[PDB]
Design an enzyme around this catalytic site. Sequence first.
Site, short mmCIF file in Angstrom:
data_model
loop_
_atom_site.label_atom_id
_atom_site.label_comp_id
_atom_site.label_asym_id
_atom_site.label_seq_id
_atom_site.Cartn_x
_atom_site.Cartn_y
_atom_site.Cartn_z
N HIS A 1 -34.55 -22.06 -60.93
CA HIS A 1 -34.36 -21.40 -62.21
C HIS A 1 -35.13 -22.18 -63.27
CE1 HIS A 1 -30.66 -20.72 -59.80
NE2 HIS A 1 -30.64 -19.51 -60.34
N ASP B 1 -33.17 -25.07 -64.30
CA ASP B 1 -33.09 -26.20 -63.37
C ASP B 1 -34.17 -27.22 -63.68
OD1 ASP B 1 -30.98 -25.12 -61.96
OD2 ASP B 1 -32.29 -24.04 -60.57
N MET C 1 -40.87 -19.04 -54.72
CA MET C 1 -39.99 -18.13 -55.42
C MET C 1 -39.50 -18.83 -56.67
SD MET C 1 -36.54 -17.65 -56.17
CE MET C 1 -35.35 -17.98 -54.87
N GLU D 1 -31.49 -9.51 -56.14
CA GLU D 1 -30.48 -10.17 -55.33
C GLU D 1 -29.11 -9.58 -55.61
OE1 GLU D 1 -30.53 -14.49 -55.34
OE2 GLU D 1 -28.35 -14.53 -55.11
N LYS E 1 -24.99 -8.91 -55.48
CA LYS E 1 -23.76 -9.64 -55.24
C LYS E 1 -22.64 -8.72 -55.71
CE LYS E 1 -21.51 -14.10 -55.89
NZ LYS E 1 -21.35 -15.30 -56.73
N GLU F 1 -28.30 -11.84 -49.65
CA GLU F 1 -27.71 -13.14 -49.34
C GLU F 1 -26.52 -12.94 -48.41
OE1 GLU F 1 -25.26 -16.55 -51.80
OE2 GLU F 1 -27.35 -16.27 -52.29
N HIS G 1 -22.96 -12.87 -49.82
CA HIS G 1 -22.71 -11.80 -50.78
C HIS G 1 -22.30 -10.50 -50.10
CE1 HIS G 1 -25.34 -13.96 -54.03
NE2 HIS G 1 -24.30 -14.66 -53.64
N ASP H 1 -31.74 -14.90 -48.67
CA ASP H 1 -30.96 -16.11 -48.96
C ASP H 1 -29.96 -16.33 -47.84
OD1 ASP H 1 -32.29 -16.52 -51.34
OD2 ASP H 1 -30.58 -16.06 -52.62
N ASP I 1 -17.18 -16.74 -53.41
CA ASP I 1 -18.49 -17.08 -52.88
C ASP I 1 -18.53 -18.55 -52.46
OD1 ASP I 1 -21.15 -17.06 -52.20
OD2 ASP I 1 -21.84 -17.06 -54.30
N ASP J 1 -20.69 -20.29 -50.45
CA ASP J 1 -21.99 -20.95 -50.31
C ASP J 1 -21.92 -22.10 -49.32
OD1 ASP J 1 -23.25 -19.27 -52.21
OD2 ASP J 1 -22.68 -20.62 -53.85
N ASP K 1 -29.41 -20.76 -50.01
CA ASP K 1 -28.68 -20.83 -51.26
C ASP K 1 -27.27 -21.23 -50.86
OD1 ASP K 1 -27.74 -20.75 -53.77
OD2 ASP K 1 -28.07 -18.59 -54.03
#
Lengths: 385, 385, 385, 385
Positions: free
Chosen positions: D52, D55, D86, D179, D181, D215, D218, D243, D253, D255, D285
């Site tokens: 991002h 980030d 990406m 993406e 979710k 993902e 998700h 993902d 979620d 992860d 992810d």
Amino acid sequence: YQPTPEDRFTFGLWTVGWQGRDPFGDATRRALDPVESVRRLAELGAHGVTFHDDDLIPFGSSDSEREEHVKRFRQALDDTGMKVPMATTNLFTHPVFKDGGFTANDRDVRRYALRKTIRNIDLAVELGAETYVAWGGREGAESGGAKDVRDALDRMKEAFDLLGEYVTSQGYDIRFAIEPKPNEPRGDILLPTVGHALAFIERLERPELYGVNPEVGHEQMAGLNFPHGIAQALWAGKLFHIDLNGQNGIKYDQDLRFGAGDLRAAFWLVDLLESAGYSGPRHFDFKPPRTEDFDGVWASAAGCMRNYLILKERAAAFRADPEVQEALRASRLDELARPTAADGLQALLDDRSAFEEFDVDAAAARGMAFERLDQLAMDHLLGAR
Amino acid sequence: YQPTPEDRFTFGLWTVGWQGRDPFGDATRRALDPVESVRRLAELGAHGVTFHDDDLIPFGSSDSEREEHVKRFRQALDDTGMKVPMATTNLFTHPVFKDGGFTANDRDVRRYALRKTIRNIDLAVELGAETYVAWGGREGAESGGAKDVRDALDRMKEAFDLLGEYVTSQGYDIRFAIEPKPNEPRGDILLPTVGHALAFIERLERPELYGVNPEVGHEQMAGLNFPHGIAQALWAGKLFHIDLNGQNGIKYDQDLRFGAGDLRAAFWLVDLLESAGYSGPRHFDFKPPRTEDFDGVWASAAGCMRNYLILKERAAAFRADPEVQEALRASRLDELARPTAADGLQALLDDRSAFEEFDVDAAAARGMAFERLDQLAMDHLLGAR
Amino acid sequence: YQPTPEDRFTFGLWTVGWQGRDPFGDATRRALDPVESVRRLAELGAHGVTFHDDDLIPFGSSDSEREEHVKRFRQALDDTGMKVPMATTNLFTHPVFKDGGFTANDRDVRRYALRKTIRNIDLAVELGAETYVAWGGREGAESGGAKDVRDALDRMKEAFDLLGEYVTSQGYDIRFAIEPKPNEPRGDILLPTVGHALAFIERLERPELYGVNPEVGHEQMAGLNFPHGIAQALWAGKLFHIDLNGQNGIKYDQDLRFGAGDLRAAFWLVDLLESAGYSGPRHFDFKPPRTEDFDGVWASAAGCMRNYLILKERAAAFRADPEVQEALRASRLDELARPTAADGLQALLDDRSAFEEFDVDAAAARGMAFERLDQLAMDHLLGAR
Amino acid sequence: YQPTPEDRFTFGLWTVGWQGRDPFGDATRRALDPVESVRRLAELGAHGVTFHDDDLIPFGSSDSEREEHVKRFRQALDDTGMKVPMATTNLFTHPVFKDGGFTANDRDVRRYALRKTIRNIDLAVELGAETYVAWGGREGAESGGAKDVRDALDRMKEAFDLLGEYVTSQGYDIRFAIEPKPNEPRGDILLPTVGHALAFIERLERPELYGVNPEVGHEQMAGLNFPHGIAQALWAGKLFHIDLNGQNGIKYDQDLRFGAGDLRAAFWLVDLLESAGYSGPRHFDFKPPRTEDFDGVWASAAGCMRNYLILKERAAAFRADPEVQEALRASRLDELARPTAADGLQALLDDRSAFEEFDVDAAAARGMAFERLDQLAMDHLLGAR
Ligand SMILES: [Mg+2]
Ligand SMILES: [Mg+2]
Ligand SMILES: [Mg+2]
Ligand SMILES: [Mg+2]
Ligand SMILES: [Mg+2]
Ligand SMILES: [Mg+2]
Ligand SMILES: [Mg+2]
Ligand SMILES: [Mg+2]
């Protein structure tokens, strides 16, 4: 539908004081002084506040700051008439509790968790709390090998027994209530449902000191019928406390205001609590969504109490309706309350009408008339009646 | 991975005998003679069969047909060496049980349910069953007003107490196991999880006569961790029996063969059963999918036992691995098994290392090393180790 | 709240005619003559019936019995004024469809499925249906290797394209609607949600001939927001038909009467359908619970229409409330409807108020006032407003 | 099972850099310098990082700090050979996005979201990213009235069309991937599943510029079959990115590292990706659990790649097994790939073997042999083959 302190509505400091930090976002609201929340909640008609030790006394406070914080809080309680019926320990925020408190693998953390709890029990008694709630939110695991569950239950029993010894040795008149949650923040949490906690209490040294504090959203995160679970807790004599909020099915713990989420379940819950004579606090554990400013926070908190009072009205109307009472007899709710075999085993065995000459096809053909009864419950809920 | 009768694998007659009728489809397979299933299952390495009364004796059979059916069945058991460790009552198929058996609103149905059960208890004892299973599949409700749950729990307790009186008065050496299911065919079923059943047993007159018969797919229909629930049942001393199958998350009861569905959970379950020394039957309650002909039925049934044996192997390899035992110590599984406070309450209170001089930041900084441990469990499961 | 044929309420023959056979129970009700259901439904205020070919014409009927059955049905339609807006094919009950119809692995079954469908399309057109619904209830898999999904989607596209060729070559004025369901009776069903079906239609040869027939309970079996999904179908111009019922979260397909299950979602659905001007049939696909006799069947069917009409009233009251319209502006629903950048890309890029001089902290501080808006929606739903 | 950069494994900076703050807990780990993560990930065998904007460049950085941060990052990429395939925008952390970015009710926030995105697209192109991912994590609602979904889809289409105009006007060779979710952090998120996103793309001005980035966790949060959804995305030609992680059923979620959660689904996913020739990045992810120190972080990240490689091996072994290929023919996977009716509509209509003389009972009696095929897939997965 205006709440009064006699409605026994209570709020956690952490509910209206939630700053709106979630897994993916920063705070959207500044922190609330507990004194300001006590005053705002009293203006809304709340009966009391609850607190984690860390809500009230910032973590790691000196004994002089600690007593300054208690004294300020005590002044707000005295200025408003707000009660503190329930207190609890934060054993989940600090990184040291990342594997739990009472069932942390590390023994020194377990001892620290017990001392942190005992300190707050003294303070809760001082502030007059009659129920001490334990939510083992960090007790559990994301992976199967991380926690031997039988050992953890031993450690959990040991912690609760010692708490019970400390309470009875101090001559405190306070009881414990276990708050179950099936998951989040752990992948799976120990004592995941009301049933699991009720079974656990029966193995404690002094079972009479422990009950449950079920929460709407938590049992619904397991797809369970929250009214059914509450009935079993009442049947056991173990509903010491209850947490009200809303939840939209099996997903993260939403902590929506009560009445949001599963509206029909909220109706059946209130019907049960009122018809059973539950006399404890009606506690709201919810989070005003982070979309909201402080005006939206108090609006959400008002809506909690309002939705309870509306549903309380509709449930009472439903139970008092003679056409409902007729329909209840039509579906044999009266026969459900009668003993199957008060005549005893031997009489049942010799009763040829119970088997040899029982007309199975006649009995099968009888309708239960459940759908008419449910549409009457619906009409009442909706104010179409 | 060939099963032997010493593996205590058992099958219900209704599992391999399922004709493939589902809510939306007709049977895809002809009915199986129980004598033929007993013989086929014995050839597959099964230890025993279980039955509902109605599986064995067609409903409404004369006393002469009834004894002809028992005698044929008894011959098949004698010709094969198959045991009958568990029997149960069908209180769910006949329309008369549409509102339940023990908690039907209609009292005459409740008495009929008890007589139907008692008759089969006599027969189960005759055939040597040591566990009598009760699955209240019709006990519950689709709507909130249809069932007062506290009354139903009274009626459920009353039924089970009377069953316990009948067993002890006959001097039978047989115990009861309650099989929980959260839903289907009812919208919500009473005693929905292992926890709810464990709590309930503690209120029976002779609690020592009752345990649980948990089923993999049933707890997973509530999103619960089935290994965790089994650990609590063992901790309570109440795992009298267990039902093995597979389930792909929260949806209808799929009754997939064991090992299908949540494979990692099946691994942790077998690890727990074997490491706890569970000595009861390994019972499969599953349905060969209706896509299958009879060859696929026996293939599915073979796969049940095979997947248990494979997982049993991998779990034992995992627990015997010195690098796992090292990792277990690294994550302090050893400290989890030690008493938090064997020194007692007062010593804990005076222990300044437990609070006043506890370095909270040092303890917080310690990693739990759970991810390395879990990847070792994964490697073992996958045979990458 | 009395229904009129102008409300366009329709029922499947299979809904009120469900005999109450479920996975664990036999029928609790005798079969209904379709002529008797048409007459009973007309008396209840229904606008029309729908049918599977096999509901109307028993499977394997001679051409003379077939026309006798149509002629009897046609007489009941003529005697009552009932319409048949929608017809569908049963490609799921007969054992031959156990691996599906259009995506069965066996090619001869796929061709048979197409011929069985085409025959009924002719009959549906004859009876005046304008929508032909396809519910691929057997299309899918219990295991991953059983179905190559890309191949199955090819076969599904091929089937639907051929159906579209047959319709346009016959000059029929009828459109197709795909009914998604995420699972049951298959472990996973192809095109599991409204989204999956909408995407699929865009790959057909004549996309304009195909839309969706979403069902409340089906999207909720995936925990999805059924109002949201309907909005997307409308946005796409693809809501050709809709199926109304109720569902209590993620579990087996309950087919409760509409308004049961998630009551708040039913309210938001009706709000959307009415405010979008949806003009198709309001079709109920539900099952009167098997606890019910025939009186309970018609009671449940009446409750379907009643709950729609009540919710339609409350939604309209909500949208017409000036305090709601004020709150809608307070939460900037008006700004949501305005183009983000009607000034175009370059103007947006040169607009320093959009970034360089945008006060991010001022914008962040603004409350959305969503909780007040939702409590107003709640008050309206509950008739506390 | 050692990863190489040719395996195209990529990680987000935010994955290994997650400090372990969750809804109920503070950070358990200090922040990671992106330069240190790039270097650590390169040592683990990763092919690339994603980011991002926030980030990489702390929010609100001056243009001189911004270029200092890019230049430091660019040095780490140059020193390690790591790619950036990406990039994405953070439109969810800052309080200003609390009601979303592209579909925020506030228009000035929507314009700010587009400018924030466009700025990062320039930077992503500069760093060589070929896919720009959009995760509308704040796009949605906790309550029904807060968001008109049709308007929001208009605003979403408008945003994506403008992004497409900007890309083509700049002559950038970069494509977008949505993406999906279903929920969290919003109560329901727009475009909740792969299907919903695929349908949406077909309404954009330049559909060829947009695909999906599904993902694992998700789609499983909706109980959906993630392999099935990926197959449909591939069938559409729209799998631009993916993902990978793990998820234990319908809950928050999680992860978890890839391979944790639903292990059988991970196997079928890899089987599909490899057999379809998916050539994009294998992006993880995931979040190392907050129980872990930095050693556990890299251990978890290693386990991601390892579990993919193990499963890739087992899937290839399964597909190459002649007994599997035999079983595939036994279940008619070959016939599934053949056109149902390449002879065309009229030939199908005149084909009496397709209906008039089709032996329905013979076809129904054929077993699909799916259970034997699935047990072979199981044996391969488990290394019992
Ligand atoms: Mg909660
Ligand atoms: Mg709580
Ligand atoms: Mg089952
Ligand atoms: Mg069972
Ligand atoms: Mg349905
Ligand atoms: Mg339907
Ligand atoms: Mg995720
Ligand atoms: Mg992601």
